[PDB]
Amino acid sequence: DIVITQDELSNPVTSGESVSISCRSSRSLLYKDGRTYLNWFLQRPGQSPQLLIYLMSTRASGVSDRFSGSGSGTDFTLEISRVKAEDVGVYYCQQFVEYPFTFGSGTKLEIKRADAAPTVSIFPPSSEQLTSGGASVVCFLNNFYPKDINVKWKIDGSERQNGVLNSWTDQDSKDSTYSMSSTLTLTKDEYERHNSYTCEATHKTSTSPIVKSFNR
Amino acid sequence: EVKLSESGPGLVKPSQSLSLTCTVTGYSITTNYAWTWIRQFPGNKLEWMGYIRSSVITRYNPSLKSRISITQDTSKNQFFLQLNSVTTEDTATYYCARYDYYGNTGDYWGQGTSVTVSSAKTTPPSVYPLAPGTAALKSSMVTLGCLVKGYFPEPVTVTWNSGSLSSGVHTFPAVLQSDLYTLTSSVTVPSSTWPSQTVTCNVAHPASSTKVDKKIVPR
Residues B8 and B84 in one domain: yes
Find the length of chain A. 216
Contacts of B105 in chain A (CB under 8 A): 39, 51, 54, 60
Q: By the 8 A CB rule, do B93 and B81 touch? A: no
* Per-residue burial over B126-144, b = 16 or more CB atoms within 10 Å of its CB, e = otherwise: bbbbbbbeeeeeeeebbbb
Shared domain for A160 and A194, answered yes or no, is: yes
Tell me: do B115 and B180 sit in the same domain: no
Q: Cβ–Cβ of A179/B170 closer than 8 Å?
A: yes
Q: Of B119, B148, B178, which residue constitutes the final position of a domain? A: B119
Are B103 and B210 contained in the same domain? no
A44/B109 Cα distance (integer angstroms): 14
Q: Does B1 touch chain A (CB under 8 A)?
A: no
Q: Does residue A127 share a domain with residue A198?
A: yes
- The count of other CB atoms within 10 Å of the CB of residue A66 is 15
Residues 159-178 of B with CB under 8 A from A: 170, 172-175, 177
Amino acid at A31: Y
Residue A78's H or E segment, with its range, is: strand A75-80
Tell whether A8 and A90 lie within a shared domain: yes
Q: HSE-up of B181 (CA within 13 Å, CB side)? A: 21
Question: Which of A84, A113, A142 is a domain's end point?
Answer: A113
Query: How many domains are there within chain B?
Result: 2
Q: How many angstroms separate the CA atoms of B198 and B215, rounded?
A: 7
The 3-state DSSP class for residue B158 equals strand
What number of H helices and E strands is found in chain A?
2, 19
CB-CB neighbors (< 8 A) of B128 in chain A: 126, 128-129, 136
Q: Report the SS3 class of residue B146.
A: strand
Contact residues for B208 (Cβ-Cβ < 8 A; gap 6+) = B122, B123, B124, B151
Q: Is A79 in the same domain as A183?
A: no
CATH number for A158: 2.60.40.10
Asked if B153 and B115 touch (Cβ cutoff 8 Å), the reply is no
Judgement on whether residues A92 and A36 belong to the same structural domain of the protein: yes
Domain range for A17 is 1-113
* Contact between chains at A136 and B63 (C-beta distance less than 8 A): no
Chain A interface, mutation test: which of B48, B191, B203, B214, most A Cβ atoms within 10 Å?
Answer: B48
Q: B92-99 and B34-40: which strand pairing?
A: antiparallel
Are B80 and B142 within one domain? no
Domain count, chain A: 2
Cα distance between residue A149 and residue A136, in whole Å? 21
- B112 φψ region: left (φ > 0), alpha (ψ -120 to 50), beta (else): left
Identify the domain containing residue B22 by its residue range: 1-119
Q: Is B84 helix (H, G, I), strand (E, B) or coil?
A: coil
CA dist B83 and B10 (Å) reads 14
One domain for residues B53 and B109 = yes
8 Å CB contact of A100 and B62: yes
Q: Which amino acid is at B153?
A: P
CA distance A57 to A35: 10
Question: Chain A residue with minimal CA distance to B218?
Answer: A126
Say if the Cβ atoms of A54 and B102 lie within 8 Å: yes
Taking the CA of residue B54 and the nearest CA in chain A, the distance in Å comes to 18
Q: Do residue A83 and residue A142 come from a single domain?
A: no
A70 and A147 assigned to the same domain: no
Q: Are residues A120 and A97 in the same domain?
A: no
Asked if B48's CB is within 8 angstroms of A102's CB, the reply is: yes
Last residue of a domain, one of B66, B95, B119: B119
B41, B67: one domain: yes
Using alpha carbons, list the distances in angstroms from residue A16 to A7, A13, A111, A113.
22, 8, 10, 11
DSSP string, A167-213: EEPPPPTTT--EEEEEEEEEEHHHHHT--EEEEEEE-TT-SS-EEEE
List b or e across B103-120, with b for residues whose CB sees 16 or more CB atoms inside 10 angstroms.
Answer: bbbbbbbbebbbbbbeee
β-strands B113-117, B11-12: how paired? parallel
> Are residues A83 and A60 both part of a single domain?
yes
- Which chain B residues are within 8 Å of A105, Cβ to Cβ? 45
CB contact under 8 A, A123 and B134: no
**Residue B152, min C-alpha distance to chain A (Å):** 17
Give the H/E segment covering residue A70: strand A67-71
Is A75 in the same domain as A145? no
Q: Kindly state whether residues A108 and A1 are assigned to the same domain.
A: yes
Same domain, B217 and B129: yes
- φ, ψ of residue B75 in degrees (nearest 5): -55, -30
Determination approach: X-ray
Q: Is residue A87 located within the same domain as residue A145?
A: no
B175 contacts A166? CB cut-off 8 A: yes
Domain boundary among the residues A78, A113, A148 is at A113
Please tell me if residue B183 touches chain A, with a CB cutoff of 8 Å. yes
**Are A183 and A170 spatial neighbours (Cβ–Cβ below 8 Å)?**
no
CATH code for the domain in which residue B83 is found: 2.60.40.10
Q: Last residue of some domain: B119, B138, B163?
A: B119
Q: Residues 18-37, chain B: which have Cβ within 8 Å of A?
A: none
Provide the residue count of chain B: 219
Partner residue opposite B128 with nearest CB, options A37, A43, A129: A129
- B94 touches B112 (CB < 8 A): yes
Residue A51: closest CA among B43, B75, B135, B38: B38
State CA A153 to chain mean position distance. 24
B2 touches chain A (CB under 8 A): no
Residues B148 and B112 in one domain: no
Q: Is B101 near chain A, with CB under 8 Å?
A: no
Q: CB distance from B109 to chain A under 8 Å?
A: yes
The answer to whether A117 faces chain B, any CB pair under 8 Å, is no
- H/E stretch holding A128 reads helix A127-132
Resolution (A): 1.7
Say yes or no: B107 and B172 in one domain.
Answer: no
Enumerate the residues of chain B whose CB falls inside 8 A of the CB of residue A134. 149
Nearest alpha carbon to residue B197 among B161, B170, B169, B147: B161
Helix (H, G, I), strand (E, B) or coil at B40: strand
B192 and B146, same structural domain?
yes
Of B192, B187, B204, nearest to B144 by C-alpha is: B187
Residues B213 and B140 occupy one common structural domain: yes
Does one domain contain both B156 and B206?
yes
Residue where a domain terminates, one of A55, A86, A113: A113
Q: How far apart, in Å, are the Cα atoms of A60 and each of A166, B20, B102?
A: 39, 28, 11
C-alpha distance from residue A200 to each of A160, A185, A211, B63, B110 (Å): 11, 16, 4, 48, 41
Q: Do A167 and B183 touch (CB under 8 A)?
A: yes
Residue B61 touches partner A, C-beta closer than 8 Å? yes
